[PDB]
């Protein structure tokens, strides 16, 4: 198969600027037979340009795309709201069909820093036999964050998990939640919970944490 | 102009074969190749294969040998068989069709998609813990599958709270996870209700102090 590697991987850019994406072939792909369509999140893909330059009906004449060869290029000269989403390029010069990894794009704001909490197990939780020790931060951008656990200082390591909110149609940020997941027995034996937080916002690294039982 | 739905079952156990089906209400179901493509959630898209009203299919070699694509002209319907699944093939599965009989393999017309789970668990609707701060409070859902979750924040003196924020669902052993939190400014407590095709649950949250 034909792979296609599509760059930048994410795109911050602002309402009314430019964009303009790459879609490089392993090969050189028949005819042009190339073609770009957009995604929203929870939506069918939609049918942008066909043919490596043909655009489709009701489609605005902001959006062309050009290339021949192994590098075809999706240009959208003038950013406007509905315009943030995920776009990917396919080729049918030959089979079997592919497409490639999609490049999103989103909008760029002054960074903004997280508000961190943290959140202890419930006595409920405890009742059953595991624990879930929750930390979360919240409105910051850009995107990228890391989060560190640390229990009696010793940075621990492969049982937490994160999930990351899209961004926020009102203000622009991401939020994102972790979870430490240890069984009954461990969280009873140790004493200082600790979520550590850097973000390029931030000059130095945040913590928050509790002690067992005061709470 | 052309309209297409979807249905089939949606939650497997490892090694059971996928059915999905796909009617087409709309033009002339007659030269067109009708294709099935999938999505894993996160990941991009995949072509699997392609059939047309005579019976003459083209496959993804990668998938090639667990496949099968037919079509039934009597209803215009056309389907997808996928023999024994692993957890790799959980993934929205979209039908769609070119254009034009006689051109590039791209596709203008779509269906809305069916997610398909694959897991060894087994149905089961979520249980509830609180999240007290120790303003923001926050609830737990826990143990659930499918992933189909919703969630809705209310007042002691019922009333819809706003101030609200979810995050998406995380898999851990076969089953899901997920929180969602409340960002507030007498009452002694604030409720967290949950929705899910196994049953809707209800838990109040207490305010710290
Ligand atoms: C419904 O409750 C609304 C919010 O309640 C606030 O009340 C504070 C006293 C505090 O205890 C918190 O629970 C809430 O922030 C309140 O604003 C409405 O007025 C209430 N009643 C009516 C008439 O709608």
């Known amino acids: 198969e034909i792979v296609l590697t599509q760059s930048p991987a994410t795109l911050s850019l602002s309402p009314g600027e430019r964009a303009t994406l790459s879609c490089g072939a392993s090969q050189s792909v028949s005819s042009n037979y190339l073609a ?11 049918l942008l340009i066909y043919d490596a330059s043909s655009r489709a009906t009701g489609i605005p004449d902001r959006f062309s795309g050009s290339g021949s ?18 776009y990917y390029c396919q080729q049918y010069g030959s089979s079997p069909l592919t497409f490639g990894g999609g490049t999103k794009v989103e909008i760029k704001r002054t960074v903004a820093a997280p508000s961190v909490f943290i959140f202890p197990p419930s006595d409920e939780q405890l009742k059953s036999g595991t624990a879930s020790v929750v930390c979360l931060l919240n409105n910051f951008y ?40 240890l069984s009954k027995a461990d969280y009873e034996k140790h004493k200082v919970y600790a979520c550590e937080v850097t973000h390029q916002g931030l000059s130095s ?3 928050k944490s509790f002690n067992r039982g005061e709470c | 102009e052309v ?3 979807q249905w ?17 209400y709309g033009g002339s179901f007659s030269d067109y190749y009708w294709s099935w493509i999938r999505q894993p959630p996160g990941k991009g898209l995949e072509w699997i294969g392609e059939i047309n009203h005579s019976g003459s299919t083209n496959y993804n070699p990668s998938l090639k040998s667990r496949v099968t694509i037919s079509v039934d002209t009597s209803k215009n319907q056309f389907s997808l068989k996928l023999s024994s699944v692993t957890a790799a093939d959980t993934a929205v599965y979209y039908c769609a069709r070119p254009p034009h009989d006689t051109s590039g393999h791209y596709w203008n017309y779509w269906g809305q998609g069916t997610l398909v789970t ?10 509830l813990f609180p999240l007290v ?5 926050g609830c737990l859902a826990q143990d659930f599958l499918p992933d189909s979750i919703t969630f809705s924040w209310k007042y002691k003196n019922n009333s819809d709270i706003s101030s609200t924020r979810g995050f998406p669902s995380v898999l851990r052993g076969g089953k899901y996870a997920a929180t969602s939190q409340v960002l507030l400014p007498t009452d002694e407590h604030v409720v967290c209700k949950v929705q899910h095709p196994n049953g809707n649950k209800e838990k109040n949250v207490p305010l710290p102090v």
Do not use: H, M
């Open chain 1, 69 to 86: 060869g192994t590098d075809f290029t999706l240009t959208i000269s003038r950013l406007e709201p509905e315009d943030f989403a995920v």
């Open chain 2, 3 to 5: 309209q297409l739905q």
């Open chain 1, 36 to 46: 770009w369509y957009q995604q929203k999140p929870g939506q069918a893909p939609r």
């Open chain 2, 118 to 127: 694959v897991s060894s668990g087994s149905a089961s609707a979520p249980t």
């Open chain 2, 133 to 137: 701060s120790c303003v923001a409070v």
């Open chain 2, 8 to 24: 089939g079952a949606g939650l497997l156990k490892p090694s059971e074969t996928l059915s999905l089906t796909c009617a087409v």
């Open chain 1, 205 to 207: 690294p945040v913590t």
């Open chain 1, 142 to 181: 850009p995107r990228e964050a890391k989060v560190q656990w640390k229990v009696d200082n010793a940075l621990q390591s492969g049982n937490s998990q994160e999930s990351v909110t899209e961004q926020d149609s009102k203000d622009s940020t991401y939020s994102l939640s972790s979870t430490l997941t």
